[PDB]
Design a protein around this ligand. Structure first.
Ligand SMILES: [Ca+2]
Ligand SMILES: [Ca+2]
Ligand SMILES: [Ca+2]
Ligand SMILES: [Ca+2]
Ligand SMILES: [Ca+2]
Ligand SMILES: [Cl-]
Ligand SMILES: [Cl-]
Length: 348
Protein backbone atom coordinates (compact mmCIF):
# COMPACT_ATOMS: atom_id res chain seq x y z
CA UNK A 1 0.00 0.00 0.00
CA UNK A 2 2.83 2.25 1.07
CA UNK A 3 4.68 1.42 -2.16
CA UNK A 4 2.02 2.97 -4.41
CA UNK A 5 1.63 6.04 -2.21
CA UNK A 6 5.35 6.73 -1.74
CA UNK A 7 5.76 6.68 -5.52
CA UNK A 8 2.67 8.81 -6.04
CA UNK A 9 3.85 11.42 -3.56
CA UNK A 10 7.34 11.53 -5.10
CA UNK A 11 5.95 11.91 -8.61
CA UNK A 12 3.57 14.62 -7.39
CA UNK A 13 6.38 16.35 -5.52
CA UNK A 14 8.46 16.43 -8.69
CA UNK A 15 5.50 18.04 -10.46
CA UNK A 16 5.14 20.62 -7.65
CA UNK A 17 8.83 21.57 -7.64
CA UNK A 18 8.38 22.49 -11.31
CA UNK A 19 4.97 24.16 -11.00
CA UNK A 20 5.93 26.37 -8.06
CA UNK A 21 8.79 28.07 -9.98
CA UNK A 22 7.11 28.20 -13.40
CA UNK A 23 6.18 31.91 -13.20
CA UNK A 24 9.71 32.91 -12.24
CA UNK A 25 11.02 30.84 -15.17
CA UNK A 26 8.67 32.57 -17.60
CA UNK A 27 9.98 35.93 -16.38
CA UNK A 28 13.60 34.78 -16.70
CA UNK A 29 13.02 33.38 -20.18
CA UNK A 30 11.52 36.71 -21.27
CA UNK A 31 14.46 38.62 -19.80
CA UNK A 32 16.94 36.32 -21.56
CA UNK A 33 15.07 36.81 -24.84
CA UNK A 34 15.26 40.58 -24.34
CA UNK A 35 18.99 40.72 -23.81
CA UNK A 36 19.40 38.24 -26.66
CA UNK A 37 17.59 40.61 -29.04
CA UNK A 38 19.56 43.57 -27.61
CA UNK A 39 22.99 42.06 -28.19
CA UNK A 40 21.96 40.50 -31.48
CA UNK A 41 21.19 44.01 -32.73
CA UNK A 42 24.48 45.30 -31.43
CA UNK A 43 26.90 42.45 -32.26
CA UNK A 44 24.94 40.41 -34.84
CA UNK A 45 24.22 36.70 -34.85
CA UNK A 46 26.54 34.83 -37.21
CA UNK A 47 26.17 31.10 -37.80
CA UNK A 48 29.62 30.78 -39.45
CA UNK A 49 33.02 31.49 -37.92
CA UNK A 50 34.16 35.00 -38.73
CA UNK A 51 36.86 37.49 -37.81
CA UNK A 52 35.89 40.31 -35.47
CA UNK A 53 37.29 43.84 -35.67
CA UNK A 54 40.42 42.90 -33.71
CA UNK A 55 40.89 40.04 -36.23
CA UNK A 56 39.98 37.21 -33.83
CA UNK A 57 37.87 34.20 -34.70
CA UNK A 58 34.35 34.46 -33.29
CA UNK A 59 30.86 33.01 -33.88
CA UNK A 60 27.28 33.48 -32.80
CA UNK A 61 26.66 36.71 -30.89
CA UNK A 62 30.26 37.91 -30.48
CA UNK A 63 31.45 34.65 -28.90
CA UNK A 64 35.25 34.75 -29.02
CA UNK A 65 36.67 31.36 -29.91
CA UNK A 66 40.43 32.01 -29.64
CA UNK A 67 42.97 34.77 -30.00
CA UNK A 68 45.28 32.40 -31.94
CA UNK A 69 45.44 33.33 -35.65
CA UNK A 70 44.57 29.71 -36.41
CA UNK A 71 41.26 28.67 -37.94
CA UNK A 72 41.99 25.11 -36.84
CA UNK A 73 42.28 26.29 -33.24
CA UNK A 74 38.99 28.15 -33.62
CA UNK A 75 37.18 25.08 -35.01
CA UNK A 76 38.48 22.93 -32.17
CA UNK A 77 37.30 25.38 -29.49
CA UNK A 78 33.92 25.56 -31.27
CA UNK A 79 33.54 21.77 -31.39
CA UNK A 80 34.33 21.63 -27.66
CA UNK A 81 31.88 24.38 -26.74
CA UNK A 82 29.04 22.92 -28.83
CA UNK A 83 29.70 19.19 -28.40
CA UNK A 84 29.69 18.16 -32.04
CA UNK A 85 31.78 18.37 -35.23
CA UNK A 86 30.39 21.70 -36.50
CA UNK A 87 32.99 22.38 -39.19
CA UNK A 88 32.73 26.08 -38.38
CA UNK A 89 28.90 26.32 -38.63
CA UNK A 90 26.25 26.35 -35.90
CA UNK A 91 22.49 26.70 -35.69
CA UNK A 92 20.44 29.47 -34.20
CA UNK A 93 19.65 27.42 -31.11
CA UNK A 94 23.31 26.60 -30.60
CA UNK A 95 24.20 30.29 -30.80
CA UNK A 96 21.46 31.01 -28.24
CA UNK A 97 22.89 28.47 -25.84
CA UNK A 98 26.38 29.88 -26.32
CA UNK A 99 24.95 33.36 -25.74
CA UNK A 100 23.15 32.31 -22.54
CA UNK A 101 26.42 30.87 -21.30
CA UNK A 102 28.30 34.10 -22.08
CA UNK A 103 25.59 36.14 -20.27
CA UNK A 104 25.92 33.98 -17.17
CA UNK A 105 29.70 34.38 -17.35
CA UNK A 106 29.41 38.16 -17.81
CA UNK A 107 27.16 38.38 -14.74
CA UNK A 108 29.55 36.20 -12.72
CA UNK A 109 32.45 38.45 -13.72
CA UNK A 110 30.44 41.58 -12.89
CA UNK A 111 29.68 40.29 -9.40
CA UNK A 112 33.36 39.39 -8.75
CA UNK A 113 34.40 42.94 -9.62
CA UNK A 114 34.23 45.30 -6.65
CA UNK A 115 33.71 48.35 -8.89
CA UNK A 116 30.83 46.74 -10.81
CA UNK A 117 28.86 44.61 -8.36
CA UNK A 118 27.21 47.46 -6.39
CA UNK A 119 26.16 49.31 -9.51
CA UNK A 120 24.82 46.12 -11.11
CA UNK A 121 22.89 45.08 -8.00
CA UNK A 122 21.26 48.52 -7.75
CA UNK A 123 20.14 48.49 -11.41
CA UNK A 124 16.71 47.33 -12.57
CA UNK A 125 16.41 44.45 -15.02
CA UNK A 126 16.52 46.49 -18.21
CA UNK A 127 19.42 48.64 -17.03
CA UNK A 128 21.37 45.57 -15.97
CA UNK A 129 21.19 44.53 -19.63
CA UNK A 130 22.83 47.83 -20.59
CA UNK A 131 25.71 47.15 -18.25
CA UNK A 132 26.09 43.58 -19.50
CA UNK A 133 26.05 44.97 -23.06
CA UNK A 134 29.03 47.17 -22.19
CA UNK A 135 30.85 44.19 -20.67
CA UNK A 136 30.31 42.20 -23.89
CA UNK A 137 31.88 45.09 -25.81
CA UNK A 138 34.95 45.97 -23.74
CA UNK A 139 35.32 43.57 -20.79
CA UNK A 140 34.85 44.03 -17.05
CA UNK A 141 38.05 46.04 -16.72
CA UNK A 142 37.06 48.42 -19.49
CA UNK A 143 33.63 49.04 -17.97
CA UNK A 144 35.04 49.39 -14.44
CA UNK A 145 37.04 52.35 -15.72
CA UNK A 146 33.82 54.38 -16.09
CA UNK A 147 34.16 55.38 -12.48
CA UNK A 148 32.14 58.63 -12.45
CA UNK A 149 29.31 57.35 -14.66
CA UNK A 150 28.95 54.15 -12.63
CA UNK A 151 28.50 56.22 -9.46
CA UNK A 152 25.81 58.28 -11.13
CA UNK A 153 24.10 55.10 -12.30
CA UNK A 154 24.24 53.61 -8.81
CA UNK A 155 22.66 56.85 -7.52
CA UNK A 156 19.95 56.89 -10.22
CA UNK A 157 21.10 60.17 -11.76
CA UNK A 158 20.03 58.91 -15.15
CA UNK A 159 20.27 62.11 -17.20
CA UNK A 160 23.74 63.05 -15.86
CA UNK A 161 25.11 59.49 -16.31
CA UNK A 162 23.87 59.68 -19.92
CA UNK A 163 25.59 63.03 -20.54
CA UNK A 164 28.83 61.73 -19.04
CA UNK A 165 28.72 58.37 -20.83
CA UNK A 166 28.58 60.16 -24.18
CA UNK A 167 31.92 61.95 -23.49
CA UNK A 168 33.96 58.75 -23.66
CA UNK A 169 36.21 57.16 -26.26
CA UNK A 170 33.65 54.31 -26.24
CA UNK A 171 30.98 56.64 -27.60
CA UNK A 172 33.36 58.21 -30.16
CA UNK A 173 34.51 54.81 -31.48
CA UNK A 174 31.00 53.20 -31.64
CA UNK A 175 28.38 55.97 -31.28
CA UNK A 176 25.33 54.24 -32.73
CA UNK A 177 25.55 51.39 -30.23
CA UNK A 178 26.61 53.69 -27.40
CA UNK A 179 23.58 55.90 -28.08
CA UNK A 180 21.28 52.86 -27.84
CA UNK A 181 22.99 51.61 -24.68
CA UNK A 182 22.87 55.10 -23.14
CA UNK A 183 19.17 55.52 -23.95
CA UNK A 184 18.64 52.19 -22.18
CA UNK A 185 20.48 53.39 -19.06
CA UNK A 186 18.71 56.75 -19.17
CA UNK A 187 15.13 55.50 -19.65
CA UNK A 188 15.13 52.00 -18.25
CA UNK A 189 13.18 50.98 -21.37
CA UNK A 190 13.79 49.11 -24.63
CA UNK A 191 12.91 52.20 -26.69
CA UNK A 192 16.27 52.31 -28.48
CA UNK A 193 15.84 48.71 -29.76
CA UNK A 194 12.05 48.25 -30.25
CA UNK A 195 11.66 49.75 -33.73
CA UNK A 196 14.57 47.81 -35.01
CA UNK A 197 13.12 44.33 -35.10
CA UNK A 198 9.69 45.63 -36.30
CA UNK A 199 8.47 45.82 -32.68
CA UNK A 200 8.07 42.04 -32.28
CA UNK A 201 10.47 41.88 -29.34
CA UNK A 202 10.53 43.12 -25.75
CA UNK A 203 6.91 42.29 -24.78
CA UNK A 204 -3.06 18.06 11.20
CA UNK A 205 -1.89 14.77 9.56
CA UNK A 206 -1.78 11.10 10.57
CA UNK A 207 1.15 8.95 11.65
CA UNK A 208 0.84 6.72 8.60
CA UNK A 209 0.56 9.69 6.23
CA UNK A 210 3.70 11.26 7.72
CA UNK A 211 5.48 7.95 7.23
CA UNK A 212 4.55 7.87 3.55
CA UNK A 213 5.76 11.45 3.03
CA UNK A 214 9.05 10.52 4.74
CA UNK A 215 9.39 7.53 2.42
CA UNK A 216 8.74 9.76 -0.60
CA UNK A 217 11.23 12.32 0.75
CA UNK A 218 13.90 9.61 0.96
CA UNK A 219 13.56 8.97 -2.81
CA UNK A 220 14.89 12.52 -3.26
CA UNK A 221 17.21 12.43 -0.20
CA UNK A 222 19.11 9.42 -1.52
CA UNK A 223 22.13 9.85 0.77
CA UNK A 224 19.91 10.05 3.85
CA UNK A 225 21.44 13.27 5.18
CA UNK A 226 17.93 14.65 5.81
CA UNK A 227 18.05 17.24 3.03
CA UNK A 228 17.32 17.54 -0.68
CA UNK A 229 20.06 19.32 -2.60
CA UNK A 230 19.87 20.83 -6.08
CA UNK A 231 21.93 17.85 -7.29
CA UNK A 232 19.58 15.30 -5.68
CA UNK A 233 16.59 17.08 -7.21
CA UNK A 234 18.25 17.09 -10.63
CA UNK A 235 18.93 13.36 -10.36
CA UNK A 236 15.23 12.69 -9.78
CA UNK A 237 13.96 15.14 -12.42
CA UNK A 238 16.20 13.57 -15.06
CA UNK A 239 15.29 9.96 -14.22
CA UNK A 240 11.67 11.12 -14.83
CA UNK A 241 12.43 12.58 -18.28
CA UNK A 242 13.01 16.24 -17.40
CA UNK A 243 16.24 18.08 -18.23
CA UNK A 244 16.25 21.19 -16.05
CA UNK A 245 19.31 23.39 -16.10
CA UNK A 246 21.27 23.97 -12.93
CA UNK A 247 19.68 27.44 -12.69
CA UNK A 248 16.14 26.04 -12.88
CA UNK A 249 16.98 23.40 -10.26
CA UNK A 250 18.39 26.13 -8.04
CA UNK A 251 15.15 28.12 -8.44
CA UNK A 252 13.03 25.10 -7.52
CA UNK A 253 15.12 24.61 -4.37
CA UNK A 254 15.10 28.31 -3.44
CA UNK A 255 11.33 28.60 -3.76
CA UNK A 256 10.72 25.83 -1.20
CA UNK A 257 13.76 26.54 1.05
CA UNK A 258 11.94 28.59 3.69
CA UNK A 259 14.84 28.84 6.13
CA UNK A 260 17.28 29.92 3.39
CA UNK A 261 19.95 27.32 4.25
CA UNK A 262 20.35 26.06 0.68
CA UNK A 263 18.64 22.62 0.96
CA UNK A 264 15.15 21.25 1.60
CA UNK A 265 14.51 19.45 4.88
CA UNK A 266 11.56 17.26 5.67
CA UNK A 267 9.47 20.07 7.24
CA UNK A 268 9.88 22.26 4.14
CA UNK A 269 8.93 19.27 1.96
CA UNK A 270 5.68 18.73 3.92
CA UNK A 271 4.88 22.43 3.68
CA UNK A 272 5.39 22.19 -0.06
CA UNK A 273 3.06 19.21 -0.32
CA UNK A 274 0.36 21.04 1.71
CA UNK A 275 0.42 24.23 -0.42
CA UNK A 276 -2.62 25.41 -2.39
CA UNK A 277 -1.71 25.10 -6.07
CA UNK A 278 -2.77 27.65 -8.69
CA UNK A 279 -5.73 26.47 -10.85
CA UNK A 280 -4.92 22.76 -10.21
CA UNK A 281 -7.63 20.57 -8.69
CA UNK A 282 -6.86 17.56 -6.52
CA UNK A 283 -8.09 15.36 -9.39
CA UNK A 284 -5.65 17.34 -11.55
CA UNK A 285 -2.72 16.01 -9.54
CA UNK A 286 -3.90 12.40 -9.62
CA UNK A 287 -4.46 12.69 -13.38
CA UNK A 288 -1.01 14.28 -13.80
CA UNK A 289 0.61 11.52 -11.75
CA UNK A 290 -1.30 8.78 -13.59
CA UNK A 291 0.10 10.05 -16.91
CA UNK A 292 3.62 9.60 -15.53
CA UNK A 293 2.89 5.94 -14.71
CA UNK A 294 1.02 5.29 -17.99
CA UNK A 295 4.02 6.01 -20.18
CA UNK A 296 2.38 5.08 -23.50
CA UNK A 297 -0.87 6.88 -22.60
CA UNK A 298 -3.22 3.97 -23.38
CA UNK A 299 -5.12 4.49 -20.07
CA UNK A 300 -3.68 1.35 -18.40
CA UNK A 301 -0.60 1.03 -16.21
CA UNK A 302 1.11 -2.22 -17.20
CA UNK A 303 3.51 -4.12 -14.96
CA UNK A 304 6.42 -3.04 -17.17
CA UNK A 305 5.37 0.62 -17.05
CA UNK A 306 5.21 0.44 -13.26
CA UNK A 307 8.57 -1.38 -13.31
CA UNK A 308 10.08 1.69 -15.05
CA UNK A 309 8.66 4.33 -12.72
CA UNK A 310 9.92 2.37 -9.71
CA UNK A 311 13.37 2.06 -11.31
CA UNK A 312 13.46 5.72 -12.36
CA UNK A 313 12.45 6.81 -8.83
CA UNK A 314 14.96 4.51 -7.16
CA UNK A 315 12.26 2.58 -5.28
CA UNK A 316 14.19 -0.69 -5.34
CA UNK A 317 11.77 -3.60 -5.81
CA UNK A 318 11.87 -7.08 -7.33
CA UNK A 319 9.92 -7.80 -10.50
CA UNK A 320 7.66 -9.94 -8.30
CA UNK A 321 7.01 -7.10 -5.88
CA UNK A 322 6.02 -4.91 -8.83
CA UNK A 323 3.63 -7.63 -10.06
CA UNK A 324 2.24 -7.73 -6.54
CA UNK A 325 1.60 -3.95 -6.67
CA UNK A 326 -0.40 -4.27 -9.91
CA UNK A 327 -2.48 -7.11 -8.47
CA UNK A 328 -3.17 -5.14 -5.29
CA UNK A 329 -4.49 -2.18 -7.31
CA UNK A 330 -6.26 -4.35 -9.91
CA UNK A 331 -10.03 -4.41 -9.31
CA UNK A 332 -11.42 -5.80 -12.58
CA UNK A 333 -8.66 -8.41 -12.95
CA UNK A 334 -7.28 -7.61 -16.42
CA UNK A 335 -3.83 -7.43 -14.83
CA UNK A 336 -3.41 -3.69 -15.47
CA UNK A 337 -4.28 -0.55 -13.50
CA UNK A 338 -6.67 1.93 -15.13
CA UNK A 339 -7.43 5.45 -13.96
CA UNK A 340 -10.27 4.64 -11.57
CA UNK A 341 -8.28 1.79 -10.04
CA UNK A 342 -5.43 4.29 -9.58
CA UNK A 343 -7.77 6.76 -7.86
CA UNK A 344 -9.02 4.05 -5.52
CA UNK A 345 -5.48 3.05 -4.56
CA UNK A 346 -4.43 6.61 -3.67
CA UNK A 347 -7.61 7.50 -1.76
CA UNK A 348 -7.33 5.10 1.17
CA1 LIG B 1 33.01 57.88 -16.58
CA1 LIG C 1 20.42 14.52 0.78
CA1 LIG D 1 16.03 24.69 4.09
CA1 LIG E 1 0.01 2.07 -20.58
CA1 LIG F 1 -7.55 -3.49 -13.98
CL1 LIG G 1 17.04 51.04 -11.53
CL1 LIG H 1 28.86 64.02 -9.36
Amino acid sequence: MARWKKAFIAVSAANRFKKISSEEEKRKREEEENIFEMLRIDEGLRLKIYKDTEGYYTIGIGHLLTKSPSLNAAKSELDKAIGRNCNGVITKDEAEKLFNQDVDAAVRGILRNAKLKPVYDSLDAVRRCALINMVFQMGETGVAGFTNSLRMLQQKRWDEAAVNLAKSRWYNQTPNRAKRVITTFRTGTWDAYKNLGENLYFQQLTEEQIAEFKEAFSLFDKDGDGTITTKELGTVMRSLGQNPTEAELQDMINEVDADGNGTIDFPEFLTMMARKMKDTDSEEEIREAFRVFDKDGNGYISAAELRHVMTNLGEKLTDEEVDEMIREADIDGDGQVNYEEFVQMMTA
